[PDB]
Write an enzyme that holds these catalytic residues in place. Structure first.
Site, short mmCIF file in Angstrom:
data_model
loop_
_atom_site.label_atom_id
_atom_site.label_comp_id
_atom_site.label_asym_id
_atom_site.label_seq_id
_atom_site.Cartn_x
_atom_site.Cartn_y
_atom_site.Cartn_z
CB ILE A 21 -0.97 -0.07 1.19
CG1 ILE A 21 -2.06 -1.10 0.91
CG2 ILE A 21 -1.53 1.30 1.54
CD1 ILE A 21 -2.83 -1.50 2.13
CB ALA A 25 11.17 7.64 7.99
N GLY A 27 9.03 2.14 8.32
CA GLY A 27 8.04 1.05 8.18
C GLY A 27 7.36 1.03 6.83
CB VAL A 29 0.87 0.24 5.14
CG1 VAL A 29 -0.44 -0.23 5.75
CG2 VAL A 29 1.40 1.46 5.84
CE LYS A 44 1.78 3.08 11.43
NZ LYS A 44 0.87 4.24 11.62
CG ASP A 139 1.08 14.23 9.38
OD1 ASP A 139 1.09 15.26 8.72
OD2 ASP A 139 1.66 13.19 9.06
#
Ligand SMILES: Cn1nccc1Nc1nccc(-c2ccn([C@H](CO)c3ccc(Cl)c(F)c3)c(=O)c2)n1
EC number: 2.7.11.24
Length: 348
Positions: A21, A25, A27, A29, A44, A139
Site C-alpha cells: 500500500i 521512514a 516502516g 503498510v 503496518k 498530521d
C-alpha cells in the site's frame, strides 16, 4: 516468511497474500488476508527501536488507538511482535483494510458538493471524538483519510499525535516541527512550541480547500515559503492579530514583511458552495483563538444535513498526563511498547 519490496513481514500463518500500500521512514503498510477471521486487513510494519522519536510515535499511536473506539477513526484489530524484548525489532499493527485514501481519490475524480460535504462531516465527526479525548492528531492531510467504496471515511496515522491534558499549560513543551508542510497552521511557524488542537482545524481547512480544487491551497517549497503562500491568500495579519503573537522574534519577523491583500475565497474557488467557502474562511483563520472549534464547525450551515449531537460520540474518559509520560530513553520506551502490546500475546 513472505516479503514485499525487500521487507520481511513475519506475520504468518494467520495473515497471508501481502500487497504493498505505502511506506514511511521506518516502516511499510500492506493489505493482507486474515485466515482466522476470513477478512481483508491492513498491516503496518514499524521498525522504530533505533531512534527515540520513532519509539515515542509508535508508543503514542498504540496507547491512543487502543483506547479509541469510533466509526471515523481506524481501530487496531491485532498487534504482532516477538515473545521476548531482545528479539523484538519489528511491531506489526493490524487494522481493517480501507479501499483507498482521499489523496489517491483526488488525483482521479472531481468530487460533487454532496461528497465534499459528507467527507467533511466525517472528518469533523472523528476530530470531535479526538479533541474530546484531549488528543491533537497533528498530521491531518488527504493521505491520512481512508475511504471505502460506500464513501465511509476513517482518520488514520496517530504517529504524530499526542495527549495535552488541558489541566496543564503546554506552552514551550510541544514538539516544534509538526504537521506535513502544506497543512501546517501559521502558529506552528510563529509559536512553534505553544500551539493547540486548533492546528487540527487548520489542517481540515487545507483539506476542504483541496477537495474543492483537486489541488493543495498552500503548496510551499520550504519552512519560510509555506508562511508566504498562506499570507499570499489571507493577506497580511491585522494589527490585533500581530499584537496577539507573544514570541517577539516571530512578531518582528512578520512586521518586517511587505503588505499583502486578501484574495477573496470566491475568486480562488468560483464554483464552490458559498456555505463551504464560509466554513473554509472560519477554519483557515490566522489567529488560533478566533479559529472556529470542532463543535461549531459541525453546527455550521454547510453540514446542517448531517449535524446531530445525539449520534456523535465523545470520549467517556478523556486522557490525562499519565499518557504523556514518554520523555525517556529509547530502551525504556521499547519496554513500554512491549508492555502495551502484551495483551495481544498468547499468555499475558
Ligand atoms: C488500499 N489503501 N490505499 C491507501 C490506503 C489503503 N488502505 C489502508 N487501510 C488501512 C490502513 C491504511 C494505512 C495507510 C497509511 N498509513 C500511514 C500513511 O498515511 C502510514 C504511517 C506510517 C508508515 Cl511507516 C506507513 F507506512 C504508513 C496508515 O497508518 C494506515 N491503509
Amino acid at each position: 516468511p513472505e516479503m514485499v519490496r525487500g521487507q520481511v513481514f513475519d506475520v504468518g500463518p494467520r495473515y497471508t497474500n501481502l500487497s504493498y500500500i505505502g511506506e514511511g521512514a521506518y516502516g511499510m503498510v500492506c493489505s493482507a488476508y486474515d485466515n482466522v477471521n476470513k477478512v481483508r486487513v491492513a498491516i503496518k510494519k514499524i521498525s522504530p527501536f533505533e531512534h527515540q522519536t520513532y519509539c515515542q510515535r509508535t508508543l503514542r499511536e498504540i496507547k491512543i488507538l487502543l483506547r479509541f473506539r469510533h466509526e471515523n477513526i481506524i481501530g487496531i484489530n491485532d498487534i504482532i511482535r516477538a515473545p521476548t524484548i531482545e528479539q523484538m525489532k519489528d511491531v506489526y499493527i493490524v487494522q481493517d483494510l480501507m479501499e483507498t485514501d482521499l489523496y489517491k481519490l483526488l488525483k482521479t475524480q472531481h468530487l460533487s458538493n454532496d461528497h465534499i460535504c459528507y467527507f467533511l462531516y466525517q472528518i469533523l465527526r472523528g476530530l470531535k471524538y479526538i479533541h474530546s479525548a484531549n488528543v491533537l492528531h497533528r498530521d491531518l492531510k488527504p493521505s491520512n483519510l481512508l475511504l471505502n467504496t460506500t464513501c465511509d471515511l476513517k482518520i488514520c496515522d496517530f504517529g504524530l499525535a499526542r495527549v495535552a491534558d488541558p489541566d496543564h499549560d503546554h506552552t514551550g513543551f510541544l514538539t516544534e516541527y509538526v504537521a506535513t508542510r502544506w497543512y501546517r497552521a501559521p502558529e506552528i511557524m510563529l509559536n512553534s512550541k505553544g500551539y493547540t488542537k486548533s492546528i487540527d482545524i487548520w489542517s481540515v481547512g487545507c483539506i476542504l480547500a483541496e477537495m474543492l480544487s483537486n489541488r493543495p491551497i498552500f503548496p510551499g517549497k520550504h519552512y519560510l515559503d509555506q508562511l508566504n503562500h498562506i499570507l499570499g491568500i489571507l493577506g497580511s495579519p491585522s494589527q490585533e492579530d500581530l499584537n496577539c503573537i507573544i514570541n517577539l522574534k516571530a512578531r518582528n519577523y512578520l512586521l518586517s514583511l511587505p503588505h499583502k491583500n486578501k484574495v477573496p475565497w470566491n475568486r480562488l474557488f468560483p464554483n464552490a458552495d458559498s456555505k463551504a467557502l464560509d466554513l473554509l474562511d472560519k477554519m483557515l483563520t490566522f489567529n488560533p483563538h478566533k479559529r472556529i472549534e470542532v463543535e461549531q464547525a459541525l453546527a455550521h450551515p454547510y453540514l446542517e444535513q448531517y449535524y446531530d449531537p445525539s449520534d456523535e460520540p465523545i470520549a467517556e474518559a478523556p486522557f490525562k498526563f499519565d499518557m504523556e509520560l514518554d520523555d525517556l530513553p529509547k530502551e525504556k520506551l521499547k519496554e513500554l511498547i512491549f508492555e502495551e502490546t502484551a495483551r495481544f500475546q498468547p499468555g499475558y
